[PDB]
Amino acid sequence: MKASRLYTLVLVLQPQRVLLGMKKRGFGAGRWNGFGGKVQEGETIEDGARRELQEESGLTVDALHKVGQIVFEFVGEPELMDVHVFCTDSIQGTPVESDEMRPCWFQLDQIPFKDMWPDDSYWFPLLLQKKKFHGYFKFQGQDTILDYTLREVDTV
Ligand SMILES: Nc1nc2c([nH]c(=O)n2[C@H]2C[C@H](O)[C@@H](COP(=O)(O)OP(=O)(O)OP(=O)(O)O)O2)c(=O)[nH]1
Ligand code: NA
Ligand code: NA
């Protein structure tokens, strides 16, 4: 069996738009995404998600809601990425560019799927329907999915 490392992913989803950030360097650079990163020792997953949102987008929220979990496996990488996905609709400041991310709002009929991780085409629609989900995706490199599972769940 493989070990996994905890990561977070945060989507600010409002009734007509979603906040994404263009990843400027590092993992997933060049793709629009939610905000997030590695959970640190001692913090809850939700608190790590709140922290990453603030660090990468400038937004401070008091509460996030867990909407899904996605496990990523890469060919040649023994460690799995266990990504805990959170949403909120409620913000009260403006996003600001960070070293990691350039935030930008997208209308919900203009989700930039071609410039997002390929797996997002499968699970993001569930997030938009306010459904909860568990997923797993195995990648060869950055572009090619070799195997995946996706299921709606009632509890994440
Ligand atoms: N939408 C989407 N997000 C993904 C996928 N794979 C994946 O790791 N993520 C998310 C989880 C995290 O938010 C981010 C990966 O973490 P990261 O490398 O940015 O972590 P970090 O901020 O701690 O890294 P760093 O600043 O130290 O370089 O990308 C995917 O296929 N789709
Ligand atoms: Na980060
Ligand atoms: Na990050």
Q: How far does the centroid of ligand 1 lie from the alpha carbon of residue 111, in Å?
A: 19
SS3 156: coil
Resolution of the experimental model, in Å, one decimal? 1.2
Sequence ranges of the domains in the chain: 1-156
Greatest extent of the chain over all pairs of C-alpha atoms, in Å: 43
**Rounded distance between C-alpha atoms, residue 80 and residue 91, angstroms:** 31
**Could you tell me which of 71, 138, 58, 69 has the C-alpha nearest to residue 100?**
58
Who's near 114: CB < 8 A, 6+ residues apart?
none
Taking the CA of residue 52 as reference, the ligand 1 atom at the shortest distance is: 22
**Rounded distance between C-alpha atoms, residue 19 and residue 15, angstroms:** 11
CATH fold, domain 1-156, is Nucleoside Triphosphate Pyrophosphohydrolase (3.90.79)
- Any known ligand binding at 97? no
**Could you tell me which of 14, 93, 96, 100 has the C-alpha nearest to residue 57?**
96
Q: How far does the centroid of ligand 3 lie from the alpha carbon of residue 136, in Å?
A: 20
CB distance 32 to 68 below 8 Å: no
Burial 104-140 (b: 16+ CB within 10 A, else e): eeeeeeebeeeebbbbbebbbebbeeeebbbbbbbbe
The answer, yes or no, to whether any atom of ligand 1 lies below 6 A from the CB of 33, is yes
Angstrom distances, CA of residue 48 to CA of 44, 75, 106, 119? 6, 27, 25, 23
Nearest CA to ligand 1 atom 5: 117
The answer, yes or no, to whether any atom of ligand 1 lies below 6 A from the CB of 83, is yes
